[PDB]
């Protein structure tokens, strides 16, 4: 199948440069162009440029001076690089492939890469259990969760039981605390009778700081 | 550059109803417009190419029309899984440009929240901070009030709320309210309570605990 997979999210210091890799499969870079689009709060969807089958590049006008796109056909990799970022370059960056080799209807997208431009430092989260109790149990259903606190920058991925538990899961959007660090909770509702039999583990991955925690959550003593 | 203006900014409709999205261009662009869907935490998904041409894998309920400057994306019978943002894109004129998007919200019957409260863990208390979490699960509509009280003292300015996007299956929302205190403050008090007010409740729901 046609797939585009991007390198991970991270923090870029103001004035420094941004680098992202798009590794593609299910097609050849010698036969298709690969485009780059970003999505920001201020400007929304914005086309940045493209590297064509034969190696030529076009860059959108405002980015022509600080953008370069290169590629490695044999490795099926496309390399995106942007210079001197300011805070408003904070955005989700995508690589994309059109339906035909010459066109611009983007049928295939990378998963996106959230890039944060900030002078701050990267910080992994602490993970605390939100334990099930009688005060979180009603009608045979217990709620439980994980508190993912004090990290920077976004994003954090959270799953439960290594992906096997998805039903009734709610991972809330992170809030920005006054410290400038983010915090979120992820909750799930399960049958209360399962609490003594099934294990519940929230899998937390904060890619920017290379922090991975599996937090087991149990009814408190 | 071509400016694409999408209207309205937000659409709110009931399931099974027909819905349509407008994209107006600053100058004529033939039928060189494509439509995309973006779901929560997702990458854009190509729905229609060249104003009206179908895309493999896209449900038949999606269709497009329009010529010149006035374009329309339609969903003949909306389903809950259609909760998303919708974007148009022109490519008659370099560089290709996108609209600012239209958000598609779904209506449903009133559903009261199930309320749960969580004391801070002993692990967090070690770090010197106490977070108390109140959970409002699976409710509609989105509007709700959460009031925190500690030993009958109304709390203000020391909590944060987060609301999920609409659920793609049942069209509900869930909400968290997190009360944050220093461990010192937390230990100086006994009764912790969040009171929830919502349209679907005949009276406020209070969940509480005593520290220890």
């Amino acid at each position: 199948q046609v797939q585009l997979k991007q390198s991970g999210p991270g923090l870029v210091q103001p004035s420094q440069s941004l680098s992202i890799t798009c590794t593609v499969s299910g097609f050849s870079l010698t036969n298709y162009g690969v485009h780059w689009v970003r999505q920001s709060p201020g400007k929304g969807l914005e086309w940045l440029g493209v590297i064509w089958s034969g190696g030529n590049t076009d860059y959108n006008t405002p980015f022509t001076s600080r953008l370069s796109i290169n590629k490695d056909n044999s490795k099926s990799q496309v390399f995106f690089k942007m210079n001197s970022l300011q805070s408003n370059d904070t955005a989700i960056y995508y690589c994309a492939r059109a339906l035909t080799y010459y066109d611009y209807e983007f049928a295939y997208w990378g998963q996106g890469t959230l890039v944060t431009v900030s002078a701050a430092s990267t910080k992994g989260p602490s993970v605390f259990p939100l334990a099930p109790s009688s005060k979180s149990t009603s009608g045979g259903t217990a709620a439980l969760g994980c508190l993912v606190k004090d990290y920077f920058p976004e994003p954090v991925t959270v799953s439960w039981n290594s992906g096997a538990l998805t039903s009734g899961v709610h991972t809330f959007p992170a809030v920005l605390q006054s410290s400038g660090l983010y915090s979120l909770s992820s909750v799930v509702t399960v049958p209360s009778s399962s609490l003594g039999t099934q294990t519940y583990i929230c899998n937390v991955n904060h890619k920017p700081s290379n922090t991975k925690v599996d937090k087991r959550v149990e009814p408190k003593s | 550059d071509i400016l694409l203006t999408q209207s309205p900014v937000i659409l709110s409709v009931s399931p099974g109803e027909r819905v349509s999205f407008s994209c107006r261009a600053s100058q004529s662009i033939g039928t060189n417009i494509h439509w995309y869907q973006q779901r929560t935490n997702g990458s854009p998904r190509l729905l229609i190419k060249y104003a009206s041409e179908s895309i493999s894998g896209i449900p038949s309920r999606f269709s497009g029309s329009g010529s010149g400057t006035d374009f329309t994306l339609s969903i003949n019978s909306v389903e809950s899984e259609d909760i998303a943002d919708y974007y148009c894109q022109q490519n008659n004129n370099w560089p290709t440009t996108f609209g600012a998007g239209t958000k598609l919200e779904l209506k449903r019957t009133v559903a009261a929240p199930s309320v749960f409260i969580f004391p801070p863990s002993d692990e967090q208390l070690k770090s010197g901070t106490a977070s108390v979490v109140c959970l409002l699960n699976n409710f509609y509509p989105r509007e709700a009030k959460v009031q925190w009280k500690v030993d009958n003292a109304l709390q203000s300015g020391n909590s944060q709320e987060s609301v999920t996007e609409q659920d793609s299956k049942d069209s509900t929302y869930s909400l968290s309210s997190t009360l944050t205190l220093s461990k010192a403050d937390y230990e100086k008090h006994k009764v912790y309570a969040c009171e929830v007010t919502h349209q679907g409740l005949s009276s406020p729901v209070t969940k509480s605990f005593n520290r220890g």
């Binding site: 999505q39 920001s40 201020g42 959230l114 959007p173 | 998007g101 958000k103």
Partner: peptide, 12 residues
């Protein structure tokens, strides 16, 4: 309102 980087959704 604007686009939210956390949820990849438009606010308000």
């Amino acid at each position: 309102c604007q686009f939210d980087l956390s949820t990849r959704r438009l606010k308000c």
